[PDB]
A paper describes a structure:
To understand the structural basis for the polymerization block imposed by DIX54-Ub, we purified the hDvl2 DIX domain (bearing Y27D), and solved its crystal structure at 2.7 Å resolution. Like other DIX domains5, the hDvl2 DIX monomer exhibits a ubiquitin-like fold, with five β-strands and an α-helix. Its structure is very similar to that of the Dvl1 DIX monomer11 (with a root-mean-square deviation (r.m.s.d). for the core Cα backbone of 1.14 Å between hDvl2 MolA and Dvl1 MolF), whereby the main differences are in two loop regions (between β1 and β2, and α1 and β3). There are marked differences in the dimensions of the DIX filament structures in the crystals: the filament of hDvl2 DIX is ∼67 Å wide, and its repeat length is 85 Å, with 6 monomers per turn, almost identical to the Axin DIX filament, whereas the filament in the Dvl1 DIX domain crystal (from the equivalent mutant, Y17D) is nearly twice as long as the Axin DIX filament, with a repeat length of ∼140 Å and 8 monomers per turn. As the helical pitch determines the packing of adjacent filaments in the crystals, it is unsurprising that the two types of DIX filaments contact each other at different sites (termed site III), but it seems likely that these contacts, like the filamental dimensions, simply reflect the different crystallization conditions. hDvl2 K54 and K58 are both located within the DIX tail portion: K54 lies at the junction between β3 and the preceding loop, flanking the DIX–DIX interface and pointing towards this interface (roughly parallel to the M2 residue V67), whereas K58 is within β3, but points away from this interface into the solvent. This predicts that a Ub moiety attached to K54 would create a steric clash with the head surface of an interacting DIX monomer, whereas one attached to K58 would be oriented perpendicularly to the filamental axis and thus not impinge on the DIX–DIX interaction (although we note that ubiquitin contains an extended flexible C-terminus, and may thus be able to adopt multiple conformations relative to the DIX domain). Given that K58 projects into the inside of the helical filament, stoichiometric ubiquitination of this residue might affect the filamental shape, which could explain why this modification limits oligomerization to a single helical pitch in solution.
Author numbering:
A (entry chain A), B (entry chain B): 11 to 91
C (entry chain C): 12 to 92
Write the structure that this text describes.
């Protein structure tokens, strides 16, 4: 029980939408995010993430089972159509 | 089989995208990377490379057959135009 | 023959490595400039050895001047305006 704030940009848009998804941050998946958008497949989804060796990246994630990178209840995403 | 993480910057952008390509790091080529992106009107590709005498450098690579410099399953690239 | 020129642009931490198809025995500042298509009014410094002092970054502005090489390599720092 809990919610996650997903902040997402659609293509070249300057200002993202913020949506609250009623899945707690500890377990929110790409599948959870997709259910809320229902985007024509096949958008590609990138998320603000940390790479062990490199530092901050926009990580592409296409596996519905994959957990999304969160910080303080928040996910930050970029969509490409 | 195996995968490589390719971290790449597009022109003057601060934060790179990270994409996983399902070719193992021992054998990933420029051609492999290009097939996932699809090149502009001749983008130039630079990769974090190691010079035997100097240390870390950005090497331009334009040969599709050329293997990309990896460290720990990762390639780091900069793209121009 | 060819020379590997490793060069930094202003305060950039990682240099580009470019291969110039002039052998190291005769590569000049003019040769290097013709490949950059001189950003223009830039000053060029090269890792060099001074007889009395030791290692320095020697400014060179004469196109005819031969560049300091070690093992097929030149290391340069560029300053623009």
């Amino acid at each position: 029980m809990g919610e996650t704030k997903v902040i997402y940009h659609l293509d070249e848009e300057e200002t993202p939408d913020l949506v609250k998804i009623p899945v707690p941050a500890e377990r929110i998946t790409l599948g959870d995010f997709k259910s809320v958008l229902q985007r024509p497949a096949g958008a590609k989804y990138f998320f603000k993430s940390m790479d062990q060796d490199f530092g901050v990246v926009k990580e592409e994630i296409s596996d519905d089972n994959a957990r999304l990178p969160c910080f303080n209840g928040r996910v930050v995403s970029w969509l490409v159509s």
